[model samples]
Target: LFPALSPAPTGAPADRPALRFGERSLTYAELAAAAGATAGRIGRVAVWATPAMETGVAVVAALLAGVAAVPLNPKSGDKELAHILSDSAPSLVLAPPDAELPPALGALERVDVDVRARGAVPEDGADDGDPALVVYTSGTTGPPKGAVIPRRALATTLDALADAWQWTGEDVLVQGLPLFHVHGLVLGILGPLRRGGSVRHLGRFSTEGAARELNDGATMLFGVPTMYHRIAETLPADPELAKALAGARLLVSGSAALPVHDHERIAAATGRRVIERYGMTETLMNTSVRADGEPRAGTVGVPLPGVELRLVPIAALDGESVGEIQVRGPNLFTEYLNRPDATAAAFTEDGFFRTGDMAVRDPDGYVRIVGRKATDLIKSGGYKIGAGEIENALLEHPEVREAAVTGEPDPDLGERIVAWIVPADPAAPPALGTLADHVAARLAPHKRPRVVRYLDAVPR
Candidate 1:
């Protein structure tokens, strides 16, 4: 499977360390055999994302079986989780034998993985070249829509990444990210696996644990701005943290922008800068600061080898005018599952994926995001939080007669979720904390409103 499950980069493919999750570990052959044993002859399968080694193996199993893999976040509330299952229609659920599942998984038959079992790797797979993963994301309309990702996208994106970051099989990666999104599931896990490298997850992110991993043989680190903020906050007190980071090869932030101030502090302390990569669930990864290139702050660097990026030509009196970022690449997702109209509406006839993100391109082929064309889309804490679903979730509140969700520039989080409301009872407005808690349960916690405003009425 792609693109390369490196074995001989260290001289033996069979004995290469492919993964490490907390106390457990797996060799390339071991991971392959484990995946082979647990795979089914089904068309689509959903993996309960514990962010575990098993979660990564389950996805790889589907990869080997030539079936599309859909991942479920156990933290997902019943309403959101139900919609994802309904839309994806996964035929089976895969989990670790020791995992104690929740009520939401009771509807489907689950196959518990026995990692110790030896099974033959499937030979000459049937659908290996077809769609490999399905990930869900919120749109301008309706509930979460599943996006079909091609196997080629994985082959292309990671292959391109190998050069962008100067990644090799000899390097080891450490991270603490969830598997539900492409950042962690695709790039975090598969990126390392492709090179035949190793993975060390922090389980839950902590500055202390990350420093320890880097001090140990881990050469690379992965995280979002939220994690970087915490790293900077604690840096002043710890000298080992600085020594460990300075010795590391690469430190990366994906899924969201890193604050310029935060970016500076890390480099100042450790003498190593954390690079940001620009991408989404739809376009796996488009650009990054190359290992050989200048580590320029506030820019997502140049496009990767196979990606073609464009700032859509805007009608302006002059060029370099702000326009929506458009990209055409081998690393693009195929379509929105079950939503043909939405699929058609998302792309240009010439085949560029229209990212609602607005940006300005520099003459040097670098681009900096200005804001988004759609106010309803909010990128906060490295996750895209749609105001559409947020408003829908808020409407469930009895005190919310009307609601509007919007994004605002945030110092820490790239953008902060703000909720505007018209109270059902004009005399008694709802408490901000109550509404925030309600949305946190209704959707994902990262999407909960950070600021609340009361309006006499919603402005048309």
Candidate 2:
């Protein structure tokens, strides 16, 4: 991966700017060597860096030097940061410049660097099975669990994605996804590296920055729906730049639901197909839209190569099948650190890791995610209703920005559906009754929400 980057000597005058950090740019070789030097000084350290460009690259450099990287969410408050640092027991911390250095990190050494400075460094061993990184996702049912992913899984995940996503050396990925997430860490970086392509790591994303990048030859872009919406808002005034992005081979979206309208809106504005893929912290990606096809809406494509999917009855879903998604493949993690019961219960007897997501397969073989099995199902009138279906239906309305449905206590019924929404155009709000009617028209009456609640978006 290091060799695949620009080989200019550290501090060289020029290599095309590979990283954008505010007003600064870091060349490939300079950035690489800086990361290596930081790892050299820290010596087998753990990192708690943000999603910004520099910190992300420094962590990558640590990997090149065989240093274990422990990624932490930058959005974490003081208490959470303290807990994670204490638990990980990292020797040093790497952070972006100008970021708040939590007082909790006073006990550890800290280093800041310009991510654009990639310089030459001596080769080091990077064994596949070595503990390359330890990352955690907010546990759906409990405290977060640190999942140790071996270098091999990262390597294999990237190699397989390059093949599945049709990534090539000529490709350039405009990376704007958060650093702590797997999409950015593995797919956003490793996938590009394995393909011998370049990644223009954005410190932050704005419609203008993204537009400039597309104009500068970024052939692919991966962002969550929120980013897409922001870019979409600025598109009417910037049709030319929007068209450049339309030429982008892949406008990939994941991390959450991609409403059909938003998907279509992006496609229409950019003149490109919006490829919606499915993945989570546990599974990098098991399925994707066909690179060349109709890009079936409401469906995350069939399982990837080396991945096997099974449909077990909901009765067996507790550990067996239908209620949750269980994936078994080369990309599976070894275990959750210090959580034996979670480690053991995370898989089936045959070894597929339970994804904890509820899904039903369509006749066309496309899997439609109903919701998170742990939270989105409601038992009413002795029948099971998938609240996700109603939520998806309501979101089809142009006024709806984001939606989530949950069960609330009811006197007459054991539990009833309750929805939370963020209006796309808050200035002109839609009535809850009207929204309910919209959902009622699209979904079965039994599946419709019993009550609706409008509220601002809350962070998960």
Name the top TM-score candidate. Answer: 1
lDDT of 1: 0.83
Off-target runs (Cα >4 Å) in candidate 1 are 3-11, 40-43, 126-129, 314-320, 374-376
- Model 2 residue 357 distance off true place after TM-score fit, in angstroms: 1.5
Clash count list over all predictions: 1, 16
Candidate maximizing lDDT: 1
Tens-place lDDT per residue, model 2, 151-248, is 76776667666766788777888867666668777887667655656677776767777777778888888877666666666777898667767777
Looking at model 2, how many pairs of residues clash? 16
Q: What TM-score would candidate 2 get against the native?
A: 0.74
Model 2 lDDT, full chain set: 0.66
TM-score of each: 0.93, 0.74
